[PDB]
């Protein structure tokens, strides 16, 4: 299945702060706070000039770890984006952003993307009224992602939505805190995201 | 073992016999007529020729010699007779060839 | 439409039959170069009307014999023994290619 392993070691490797724990990744301790260098016995030893290949591979491993997708699905999305009209780079992020588990994260129903995934798998989520437990379900403009009724009481869902009060949400989304429901307005524009990723390098990685 | 539809084989055997016997009568008469025409025996020849014709068409009523196959025979037959006779005699009985 | 081909008569040594040589040129499927290929058809000439050297039209027809499914439609022009000659020499040439050749 998914990764399921030490995640702050991934941030360290990528030399950038990836938010894979939601909270704590804000505390004085995402480790990127103390030891923002690679994990392992040689983590501090002087680094060596990376090969053009290495750069792409990492930038890609970076953009993929952020969403927590397998290389299998990641590449499939990438291929779908290549076939599609318009800048592959953005469209790819467009699709990545459209993953339900992800949308749940962008609306705050869950503090992390992994948590969002569990929230979906365990059926505490719903698209257009119907239950949907597929983390990879593709959300379309107009859909309404909401917390399932039966679960509008989970202590966890309270907190997350309580904290959502007075918090802004992505320009391409809309959140109704009281009704624990959100809506996917439009596909995010590349300029709408602030990803520490240079999607081009990723495209290049696959041209090889 | 034992597909009772070997009844098809039985039947085929009889049909075979029925067909076989019809065709022989046909060949035999046809030969007989062409043989008489080739001798000038006009009336006698035409007489038989019609039998052949009748037997051939009758044969065409069922599987035996069904078809244009019948026509082909009548044709070839009414052809050799008239030709053989013209090479001498006159169409007496005229019981088949048209004026 | 029954096919109608145009060709020269390169043989009348058969009763009621003429060998019609037919050419056709066209772009080579890979190299482009307009190449030129030909074939011989045994055509029916009941009246023995057509002579060696005639450029006649040939037309698809109900089989007259094995190897023979075309009838001579008409004469297009004649006395073109130059064409027959080419064919004949090409053939003559051949008998000088194996262990049974001779003329240079």
């Amino acid at each position: 299945g998914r990764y399921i392993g030490p995640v702050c070691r991934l941030c360290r490797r990528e030399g950038v702060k990836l938010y894979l724990k939601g909270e704590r990744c804000y505390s004085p301790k995402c480790a990127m706070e103390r030891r923002p260098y690679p994990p392992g016995q040689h983590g501090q030893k002087r680094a060596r000039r990376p090969s053009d290949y290495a750069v792409r591979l990492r930038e890609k491993q970076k953009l993929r770890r952020i969403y927590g997708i397998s290389e299998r699905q990641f590449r499939n999305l990438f291929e779908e984006a290549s076939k599609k009209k318009g800048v592959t780079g953005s469209v790819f992020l467009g699709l990545l952003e459209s993953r339900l588990d992800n949308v749940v994260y962008r609306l705050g129903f869950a503090v992390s993307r992994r948590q969002a995934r569990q929230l979906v798998r365990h059926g505490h989520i719903t698209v257009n009224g119907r239950r949907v437990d597929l983390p990879s379900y593709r959300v379309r403009p107009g859909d309404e992602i909401a917390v399932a009724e039966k679960s509008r009481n989970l202590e966890l869902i309270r907190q997350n939505l309580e904290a959502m009060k007075g918090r802004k949400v992505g320009p391409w989304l809309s959140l109704d805190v009281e009704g624990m429901k959100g809506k996917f307005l439009r596909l995010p524009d590349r300029e709408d995201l602030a990803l520490p990723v240079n999607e081009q390098l990723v495209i290049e990685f696959y041209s090889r | 073992r034992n597909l009772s539809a070997l009844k098809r084989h039985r039947q085929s055997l009889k049909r075979r016999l029925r067909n076989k016997a019809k065709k022989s009568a046909i060949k035999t008469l046809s030969k007989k007529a062409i043989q008489l025409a080739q001798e000038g025996k006009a009336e006698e020849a035409l007489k038989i020729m019609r039998k052949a014709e009748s037997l051939i068409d009758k044969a065409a009523k069922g599987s035996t010699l069904h078809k244009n196959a019948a026509a082909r025979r009548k044709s070839r037959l009414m052809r050799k007779v008239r030709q053989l006779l013209e090479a001498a005699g006159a169409p007496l009985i005229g019981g088949g060839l048209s004026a | 439409p029954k096919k109608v081909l145009t060709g020269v008569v390169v043989s009348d040594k058969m009763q009621k039959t003429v060998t019609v040589l037919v050419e056709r040129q066209f772009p080579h499927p890979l190299y482009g170069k307009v190449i030129k290929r030909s074939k011989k058809y045994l055509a029916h000439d009941p009246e023995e009307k057509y002579k060696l050297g005639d450029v006649v039209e040939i037309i698809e027809s109900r089989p007259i014999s094995k190897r023979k499914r075309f009838r001579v439609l008409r004469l297009v022009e004649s006395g073109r023994m130059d064409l027959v000659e080419k064919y004949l020499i090409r053939r003559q040439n051949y008998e000088s290619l194996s262990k049974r050749g001779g003329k240079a």
């Binding site: - | - | 080579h28 190299y31 482009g32 170069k33 190449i35």
Partner: protein, 124 residues
């Protein structure tokens, strides 16, 4: 060459020879060990490389390498060949698969175990 020459002779599709006559181009082939020898490598190298002479079901009798430190093959050991030559042993173009037939998997192997045919040891 001119286009005319190309029309007259065209190009020649050249085919490649197999580096592995394991007949049927089967991915593997079974056989019996005829001889279990030892062989010396070429020039740069020196050592007592382990090789086996195998009589194949494909009707061939070729020499195959016996990878790994272990090895329990004798003059009648039935085994599976796979193809993969040995840069050092001219003539050796196939490898014997360890862990199949009479070929024991390398024991105590703890790393590239799936090659060498070695099952996973209990960890605690």
């Amino acid at each position: 060459p001119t286009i005319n020459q190309l029309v007259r002779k065209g190009r020649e599709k050249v085919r490649k020879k197999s580096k592995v006559p394991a007949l049927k181009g089967a991915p593997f082939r079974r056989g019996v060990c005829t001889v279990v020898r030892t062989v010396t490598p070429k020039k740069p190298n020196s050592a007592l490389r382990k090789v086996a002479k195998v009589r194949l079901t494909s009707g061939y009798e070729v020499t195959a390498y016996i990878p790994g430190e272990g090895h329990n093959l004798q003059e009648h050991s039935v085994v599976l060949i796979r193809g993969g030559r040995v840069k050092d042993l001219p003539g050796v173009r196939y490898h014997i698969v360890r862990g199949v037939y009479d070929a024991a998997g390398v024991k105590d192997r703890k790393k590239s175990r799936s090659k060498y045919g070695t099952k996973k040891p209990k960890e605690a």
